[PDB]
């Protein structure tokens, strides 16, 4: 049985951490909930919308992240995202070379397991990889974090709540608060489903604006530039009722 040992499962808000194993079976994966009273969690391949490998490069952990089509029960909550991670951690030079070695080994181990999940899904799943070189700093929640695209998504997987935007589902991206002086701007992702709450990524370094414009265009996502922060509460209620 293909397995990934000694990992930790998230979401885990406040339970003492306990290493566990993810096992691959005929129709999906199974693993131990980080919340003790829960009993084994099974996720069917057919319920996985995105299977993401995120390298530990520039981060403290390596990640396999699963974004679900339908929410599953775990830790008494219905959740749409589950992930497995491990933390990346003689003379000073050798200590640094060893750390690089371990980090490369960690990425390879996690990438192989993600590949084994895709293989067992018989065509259903494709491993998406985050592209660090295309990533940018921004604030979807409270802290400044690093958002990265894959071939199909824009994600933020380090700081919960985890964010997975499927690019095919985006109606438009409005770039807000871009002005003469300012050193940062705000992004709003509007989904084609107008009942879906828009996604704000605030405080993106102004120095990334041109790169994101092109990336957006490369992903066939229309954008509009705004000097101010728009309404959204108002704006969406419009599109929901009628144009």
DSSP string, 34-60: SSGGG--EEEEGGGEEEEEEE--TTSS
Distances (CA, A) of 208 to 163, 165, 191, 236: 20, 19, 22, 27
Strands 223-225 vs 170-176: parallel, antiparallel or unpaired: parallel
Task: Return the C-alpha torsion angle 175, 144, 165, 127, nearest 10.
Answer: 130
Question: Under a CB-based contact definition with an 8 Å cutoff, are residues 28 and 70 in contact?
Answer: no
- Distance, in Å, from the CA atom of 79 to the CA atom of 132, rounded to the nearest integer, reads 26
Residue with tokens 């885990």: 12
Question: Under a CB-based contact definition with an 8 Å cutoff, are residues 32 and 20 in contact?
Answer: yes
Question: Under a CB-based contact definition with an 8 Å cutoff, are residues 196 and 212 in contact?
Answer: no
Strands 61-74 vs 48-54: parallel, antiparallel or unpaired: antiparallel
- Distance, in Å, from the CA atom of 91 to the CA atom of 32, rounded to the nearest integer, reads 39
Domains, the chain, in order of start with CATH, read 1-128 (2.30.29.150), 129-243 (2.30.29.30)
Omega within 30 of 0 (cis) for the link into 161:
yes
């Amino acid at each position: 049985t293909k397995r990934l040992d000694q990992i930790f499962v998230r979401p885990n808000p406040d339970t003492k951490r306990v290493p566990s194993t993810v096992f691959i079976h005929e129709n999906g994966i199974r693993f131990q909930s980080p919340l003790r009273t829960d009993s084994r969690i099974d996720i069917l391949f057919s319920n996985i919308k995105n299977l993401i490998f995120q390298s530990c490069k520039g981060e403290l952990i390596v990640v396999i992240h699963i974004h679900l089509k339908n929410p599953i029960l775990m830790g008494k909550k219905k959740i749409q995202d589950v992930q497995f991670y491990r933390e990346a951690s003689e003379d000073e030079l050798e200590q640094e070379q060893e750390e690089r070695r371990k980090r490369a080994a960690l990425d390879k181990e996690f990438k192989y397991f993600a590949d084994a999940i895709a293989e067992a899904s018989n065509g259903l799943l494709t491993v998406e990889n985050t592209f660090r070189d295309l990533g940018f700093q921004g604030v979807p929640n409270r802290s400044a974090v690093f958002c990265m695209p894959t071939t199909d998504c824009l994600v933020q997987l380090i700081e919960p709540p985890f964010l997975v935007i499927n690019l095919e589902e985006v109606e438009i991206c409005i770039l807000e608060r871009v002005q003469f002086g300012l050193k940062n701007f705000d992004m709003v992702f509007v989904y084609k489903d107008f009942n879906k709450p828009v996604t704000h990524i605030n405080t993106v370094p102004i120095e990334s604006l041109d790169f994101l414009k092109q990336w957006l265009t490369d992903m066939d996502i229309p954008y509009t530039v705004s000097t101010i922060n728009l309404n959204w509460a108002t704006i969406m209620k419009s599109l929901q009722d009628d144009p």
